[PDB]
Swiss-Prot record, chain A:
Domain of life: Eukaryota
Organism name: Rattus norvegicus (Rat)
PTM comment text: Polyubiquitinated. Polyubiquitination targets ITPR1 for proteasomal degradation. Approximately 40% of the ITPR1-associated ubiquitin is monoubiquitin, and polyubiquitins are both 'Lys-48'- and 'Lys-63'-linked.
Compartmental location: Endoplasmic reticulum membrane; Cytoplasmic vesicle, Secretory vesicle membrane; Cytoplasm, Perinuclear region
Record remark on domains: The ITPR1 structure has a large solenoid CY assembly built around the central helical bundle made of the C-terminal domains from four ITPR1 subunits. The solenoid scaffold includes domains responsible for binding of ligands and regulatory proteins and is connected via an allosteric nexus at the cytosolic-membrane interface to the transmembrane channel assembly. Six transmembrane helices from each subunit form the central ion-conduction pore.
Chain sites annotated for binding Ca(2+) 1: 67, 355, 358
Subunit structure: Homotetramer. Homodimer. Interacts with ERP44 in a pH-, redox state- and calcium-dependent manner which results in the inhibition the calcium channel activity. The strength of this interaction inversely correlates with calcium concentration. Part of cGMP kinase signaling complex at least composed of ACTA2/alpha-actin, CNN1/calponin H1, PLN/phospholamban, PRKG1 and ITPR1. Interacts with IRAG1. Interacts with CABP1 (via N-terminus). Interacts with TESPA1.
Residues lipid-modified (S-palmitoyl cysteine): 169
Family under the similarity heading: Belongs to the InsP3 receptor family.
Protein name: Inositol 1,4,5-trisphosphate-gated calcium channel ITPR1
Segment of the intact protein contained: 640 to 1130 of 2750
Amino acid sequence: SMNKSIPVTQELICKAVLNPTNADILIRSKSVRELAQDAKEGQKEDRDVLSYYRYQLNLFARMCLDRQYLAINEISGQLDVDLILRCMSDENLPYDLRASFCRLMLHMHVDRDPQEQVTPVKYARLWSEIPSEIAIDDYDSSGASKDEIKERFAQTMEFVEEYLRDVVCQRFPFSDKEKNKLTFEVVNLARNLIYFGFYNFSDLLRLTKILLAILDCVPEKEDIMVMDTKLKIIEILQFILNVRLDYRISCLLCIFKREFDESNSQSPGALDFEHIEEQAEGIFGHGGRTFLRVLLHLTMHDYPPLVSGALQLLFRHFSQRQEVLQAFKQVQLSQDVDNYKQIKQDLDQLRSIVEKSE
Amino acid sequence: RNIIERLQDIVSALEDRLRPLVQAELSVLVDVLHRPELLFPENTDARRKCESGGFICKLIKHTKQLLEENEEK
């Protein structure tokens, strides 16, 4: 039923549980001692673990897409935030891997319909409005308890920091099926960053970690999907440059000084080729160490797989760094009429959809 | 002043575009040159496990995917 992602069946199953509620004999103190009982490698603990594994799919079938039944799926979810701490400290590698999935599903269902991944708002105030290259202050109120999700984000980056030494283990140790057990450890945890829209600098650090994880020697079914997950994670960084560039350009343009006095780079015919050769000196030989990013794209190309075309597309896009951002200046689009402008944009989108259908 | 801003935008775009166009061509060539010269990050590929087959293998795979894949933009 869960696989269907098929709503009616999910509702029926949810209604159906009420009667038995269990199959074995049974919680915070009982779980840690059961974790200690699970520390005994043999037999009853194995049975308990199997039941728990099935149970997450119990959340997983429950967590297909439904927000109404997710409210009915709720008590388990409050328990799950608390459990989620148990997913970290337990060392339940095969176990708490499902515990991460459930938590993510619950949080996502619980809040903010917008699904904040892509920043469409490229404009700003009538002035530059405090050119702020250190800190971004976009909405601040899309989540009511933004720190409530940020508390999960506080649990998020520590779990993301848990992948950090794991790069020295998932990479320093080779890829194995036990490593594929740990491969489930990050197996969807980066997907939580996809709904994650609370901050940006940490994302840059995470991208660096992914490249680091990628290299040392020379398939991974979920591992390529793990790379396929991280390849989606690379796409979010492409928005940042454009936003920063747009803001800087606008600020420079606005002031009364606007007569050709703007020669600044966003990251001489021979002088361009000299800068090309100088960039080629940087090439053949967010302003960190860029060589790893280039290498990562090449490495992905070497890796292959059926999702490889998506990876290749990302590499070409990454190679360009400002060119479409100039073309993005044309795609940008009054404080009073800006709502009507927003309304018009929505209407226009509907019209465009209709035109596409036609 | 909006019209002036748009114009300023156009002029900026042209300069960025001339310089940008040259830069883009150079970047592509290097990447093109790099592919011809696929050895930069392939020091690990030259350390071991990399063949330096490059662009030809990539091109074949890419071509098949693109043809059967989505829009070839």
